[PDB]
Write a protein that binds this ligand. Sequence first.
Ligand SMILES: CN(C)CCCN1c2ccccc2CCc2ccc(Cl)cc21
Ligand SMILES: CN(C)CCCN1c2ccccc2CCc2ccc(Cl)cc21
Ligand SMILES: CCCCCCCCO[C@@H]1O[C@H](CO)[C@@H](O)[C@H](O)[C@H]1O
Ligand SMILES: CCCCCCCCO[C@@H]1O[C@H](CO)[C@@H](O)[C@H](O)[C@H]1O
Ligand SMILES: CCCCCCCCO[C@@H]1O[C@H](CO)[C@@H](O)[C@H](O)[C@H]1O
Ligand SMILES: CCCCCCCCO[C@@H]1O[C@H](CO)[C@@H](O)[C@H](O)[C@H]1O
Ligand SMILES: CCCCCCCCO[C@@H]1O[C@H](CO)[C@@H](O)[C@H](O)[C@H]1O
Ligand SMILES: CC(C)C[C@H](N)C(=O)O
Ligand code: NA
Ligand code: NA
Length: 512
Amino acid sequence: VKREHWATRLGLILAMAGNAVGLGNFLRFPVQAAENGGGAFMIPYIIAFLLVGIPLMWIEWAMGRYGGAQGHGTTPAIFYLLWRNRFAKILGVFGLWIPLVVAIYYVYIESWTLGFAIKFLVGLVPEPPPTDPDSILRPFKEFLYSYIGVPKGDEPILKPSLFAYIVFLITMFINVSILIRGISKGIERFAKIAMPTLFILAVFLVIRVFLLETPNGTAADGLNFLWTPDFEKLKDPGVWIAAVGQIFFTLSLGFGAIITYASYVRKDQDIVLSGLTAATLNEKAEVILGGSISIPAAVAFFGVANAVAIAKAGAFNLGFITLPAIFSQTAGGTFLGFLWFFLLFFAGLTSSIAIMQPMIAFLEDELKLSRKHAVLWTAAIVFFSAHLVMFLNKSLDEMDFWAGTIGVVFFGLTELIIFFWIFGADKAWEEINRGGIIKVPRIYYYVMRYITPAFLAVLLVVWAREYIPKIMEETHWTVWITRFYIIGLFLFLTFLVFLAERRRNHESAGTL
Ligand SMILES: CN(C)CCCN1c2ccccc2CCc2ccc(Cl)cc21
Ligand SMILES: CN(C)CCCN1c2ccccc2CCc2ccc(Cl)cc21
Ligand SMILES: CCCCCCCCO[C@@H]1O[C@H](CO)[C@@H](O)[C@H](O)[C@H]1O
Ligand SMILES: CCCCCCCCO[C@@H]1O[C@H](CO)[C@@H](O)[C@H](O)[C@H]1O
Ligand SMILES: CCCCCCCCO[C@@H]1O[C@H](CO)[C@@H](O)[C@H](O)[C@H]1O
Ligand SMILES: CCCCCCCCO[C@@H]1O[C@H](CO)[C@@H](O)[C@H](O)[C@H]1O
Ligand SMILES: CCCCCCCCO[C@@H]1O[C@H](CO)[C@@H](O)[C@H](O)[C@H]1O
Ligand SMILES: CC(C)C[C@H](N)C(=O)O
Ligand code: NA
Ligand code: NA
């Protein structure tokens, strides 16, 4: 062919919206917000969306469409197209490494939601007794802990239940069944089914939650806590780092995923309005839907102070333990739990296929593998690698940090510098607006060229100076097992880019 292309504009928008709308909206956002003072988190969040989220979204859509027009959907080649320096290809490897590493733990978490959905649907759930908080949360904590196999001793090892393992296998098979059908007949087709389902399930859950009321509060108290400003924290670096990190994660920015999806957009197609729409749809799903489910429910039943303590407790407690526990105290609560996990599963699935496609696109575009082989090998690498996340306690956290937290911010800055500084601000601006149904507001030219990069640069330095040291000095030794492995993955991916180069050289000397 030349390239596969999104069939319809609606399919394109829903596929991109599904790329973005995932576990980050319903699980990550609530914890981050509650953990950072709720309303106090929102100001930096909104600012990050305007100064970082929106501008980078347009930039990645532009880079992808630009690359696609020349038959390239991933950063190793696209970065090179924008800056013909071998170093561009190496920096580009992060556009394959980040999504791959994130997929290695993201699909596993996604599989938990399918496993929970299954168990809640058939009623194989814990039975709490008769209004102490712990006698109520404990059965659900044990339920999660037995599912993933949390360490009961001193060894930093996890023991996933057999059901969890088999469900991960099924989950991988489901991701493959969609990806193996390609862009239009696979990802786009699925998005047209999943997004509407996702929206309906989420609205229903918000409505149900809004009816919650106990001696400790109502869902309204939850919304008040999340949407009430606290200008006295606008000066804490930590809240800003959390806010910006969430924006990157929730919009799928810096993962090379938006770029790859955009590489299937026809060269002439608009990306300004489409990009803004995908981004806007994600924010609504995040702040309106995701923000209105778990926090209001937790606050209604336990009050703000306890809700916050829950979010800070961590380990998927809010979404996999607390919410289902709360639901169990209501009529039809087990089924509500099913709907919650089913919602999470579809949110995750539409996002995981998005972070596996970069590796698939690279194998197809640069190594010329058939889609079938590219999808199967990608799945094999993710499946194999995930065993590290399934059996080594904290490996998931380590990957989520280096690739999904630090990595994306670093890559976002990198792609911006390459596209807006090296490739050329005016050429980049031109490329972004080309074919647009609407033009990017002019003030954004200055935001992209000066504000965004300066913003990310400062964030990254603050990170390396007052946070990375603790992570490098105060963690259990087992973190090095994961660091070693993912560094190895980077090395391997660089080797593949080298092979792509050599294949390119040999076909050019065969093109003459
Ligand atoms: C009414 N049916 C069209 C929906 C079931 C098909 N579907 C689907 C839809 C569009 C494009 C690819 C795929 C692949 C198979 C698959 C796998 C899992 C799920 Cl959760 C849905 C699903
Ligand atoms: C601290 N870890 C136990 C958890 C890290 C995983 N993670 C994550 C990663 C992918 C998808 C959903 C979620 C939900 C939980 C959550 C909450 C806050 C943060 Cl900042 C990360 C985070
Ligand atoms: C292909 C790479 C394989 C690495 C070793 C994988 C071992 C998986 O082993 C399986 O794990 C499940 C969940 O913990 C258990 O329920 C099964 O009984 C066990 O056989
Ligand atoms: C979606 C269907 C998943 C079926 C796998 C369920 C695994 C849950 O549990 C396992 O089931 C096995 C066979 O029933 C038993 O031999 C194991 O002892 C038991 O732990
Ligand atoms: C870095 C990833 C390494 C994965 C190696 C997994 C080896 C699996 O090991 C197996 O796990 C089962 C369930 O936990 C146990 O029941 C078996 O006794 C054990 O041998
Ligand atoms: C990241 C690696 C996680 C590994 C989890 C391993 C759980 C293994 O289980 C252990 O395997 C050993 C060797 O087979 C046996 O000698 C032990 O008796 C057994 O408990
Ligand atoms: C920090 C980023 C803020 C983005 C808000 C942009 C609001 C758009 O602002 C509008 O842009 C148009 C096109 O440039 C101008 O013609 C209008 O006069 C201006 O009000
Ligand atoms: C890594 C990304 C695909 C994650 C997705 N944007 C989410 O919010 O879950
Ligand atoms: Na999102
Ligand atoms: Na999604």
